[PDB]
UniProtKB/Swiss-Prot annotation, chains A, B:
Species whose genome carries this gene: Streptomyces griseus
Effect recorded for residue 329 to R: In strain: ISP 5236
Record-given protein name: Inosamine-phosphate amidinotransferase 1
Record: active site: 179, 227, 332
Family: Belongs to the amidinotransferase family.
Keywords for this protein: Antibiotic biosynthesis, Streptomycin biosynthesis, Transferase
SUPFAM superfamilies noted in UniProt: Pentein
Quaternary context: Homodimer.
């Protein structure tokens, strides 16, 4: 009886992983971090604000983070947190050198598709050994019958990046690279956004690793530059929330065309602490569905909670203050390893 | 029509990978290299002879290596060679730091079980990014329909090693670790030698990655301390060559008990250049079967060539002079990516 059993984004959550803010940082300046994350706000990679986030943001989001875990426990969910890791410790391969990121977004490079966990081949050199903080959880999952796979570790030479190109095109297609957060899971159907943090070869590879049961749907016309997370948010079978500045009627994936679609209201601008914000105001949409009638939304998105309730979706409004600074909402900041339920196909 | 299709050790070779001696070195002294390779000849890891092998050995084996590629080409096999890589370039993770090994033994950390290639989780930190020299080949294989997987990259902390234990017990069982060269492939049945370069969890993991079709047979009573390569040598279905100092009648794996077994004659001691030899005289047995009736054997093993011919096995005797120095025979120094044939079960 594997501990990892999960087929979609909305069934009744049994066990999740939450994630800390403890040594969060901005890696050293570098082609890849520049090309995938900051080459739209800064003139050159040497202007990226490398360094550790201010203590105030890590303190405050760590207590917010404690509340999330607390309430999910109250709801009956089993909460697991990351192991300790130094993010300033250097990582160095024959081709390049860097420091680490943070362990605030477990969603990003760990993908759970059934009884299997896949360590994806992340676009950023700093996240080269992303799963190191989770070795003990994984090991336990493994010893319980969960299948545990990894994608080949990428070369990630200068040629895989294209700072100067237009957005959603600065990640070349030389090898399978993709963050897990570029994939969304609707049972058999797997949606894969091809953008600045995941190429075509990555979805080529994603398909072979999960096999014929599932069908990977790569998308290159949505305007997400990086993760699908705050662009398409499924809520229960047959109802999906979309980002109106990005997805439209000529956009929408084909297997989702039958689901009823509710357009997100324009969000409140929670602030940002910095020079330039790290995330678009659309992390307001980064919600986490607990069961088909329960979802966690930031309590300042009163337009958004209203709407969700109008469609018979009860909310539990918690708050993540530094979301635009660290770039992570409830979904980015969690990883669901088991939801009660079975494997099905939602095309109506 | 994937370029990677191979079910066993002896069917008719179509495409192989050969491998250079170009920048071969002995890594910097370190717990893992000491525990898995030198802790039976040296008093402590600080005595290991780190450094680049003498030019004479690399020059001479590289021309010998040119002849091997030349003759297999003559036989109609497609020969591919590794890419260029600096082995002195440092590799550094949060836990440790090192320089690389060599790209002379493609067999060791790349496993081809059907249409799939598995980058195994190598026991030595210097071989942490073993597959980097092969990125372009694998990329091509990948783009051709071959399934391309990797085992989770190991933490490989001080806890996974046990210098002071008896041989075949200095690699603890904390996480799936195992070199591909610890596995031997007889179609459905996969023999996995559990020893100093591969644990029980590695075979636990190996089973999950390949699935129910195959059955992994872990072995802890053969006396190989590292690789199964020069201990059990299948030659054609129903005939296996065994190492008499290691395997016997109370040893032999159960699915092999029906195959007829021929005992290896005592070999010629080709020399070693160094202080202490790097491989046992039994690399004389590291032969490479090209087809069921053709095998490549070092031409100084005249007892062995005779015997093989006695059992209707034709040999093509080439020579690898520095085999006890670099530790690689014809099998260690090659990687077969495709043999003409199909998937079967040889239990008679």
């Amino acid at each position: 009886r594997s501990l990892v059993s999960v087929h979609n984004e909305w069934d009744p959550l049994e066990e999740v992983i939450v994630g800390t803010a403890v040594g969060a940082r901005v890696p050293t300046a570098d082609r890849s971090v520049f090309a995938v994350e900051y080459a739209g706000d800064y003139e050159s990679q040497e202007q990226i604000p490398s360094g550790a986030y201010p203590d105030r943001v890590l303190k405050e989001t760590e207590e917010e983070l404690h509340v999330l875990a607390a309430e999910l426990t109250k709801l009956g969910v089993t909460v697991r947190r990351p192991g300790p890791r130094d993010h300033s410790a250097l990582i160095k391969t024959p081709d390049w050198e860097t420091d680490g990121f943070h362990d605030y977004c477990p969603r990003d490079g760990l993908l759970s598709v059934g009884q299997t966990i896949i360590e994806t081949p992340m676009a950023l050199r700093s996240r080269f050994l992303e799963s190191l903080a989770y070795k003990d959880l994984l090991l336990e999952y493994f010893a319980s019958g969960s299948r545990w796979l990894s994608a080949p570790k990428p070369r990630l030479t200068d040629d895989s990046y294209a700072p100067q190109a237009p957005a959603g095109e600065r990640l070349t297609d030389e090898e399978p690279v993709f963050d897990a957060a570029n994939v969304l899971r609707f049972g058999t159907d797997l949606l894969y956004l091809v953008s600045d943090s995941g190429n075509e070869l990555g979805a080529k590879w994603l398909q072979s690793a999960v096999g014929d049961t599932y069908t990977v749907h790569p998308c290159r016309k949505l305007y997400a530059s990086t993760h699908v997370d705050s662009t398409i948010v499924p809520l229960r079978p047959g109802l999906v929330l979309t980002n109106p500045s990005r997805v439209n009627d000529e956009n929408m994936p084909d297997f989702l065309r039958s689901w009823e679609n509710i357009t997100c209201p324009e969000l409140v601008d929670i602030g940002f602490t910095g020079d330039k914000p790290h995330c678009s105001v659309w992390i307001g949409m980064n919600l986490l569905v607990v069961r088909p009638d329960l979802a966690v939304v930031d309590r300042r998105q009163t337009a958004l909670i209203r709407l969700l309730e109008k469609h018979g979706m009860n909310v539990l409004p918690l708050q993540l203050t530094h979301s635009r600074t660290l770039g992570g909402g409830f979904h980015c900041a969690t990883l669901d390893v088991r939801r009660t339920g079975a494997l099905e196909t939602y095309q109506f």
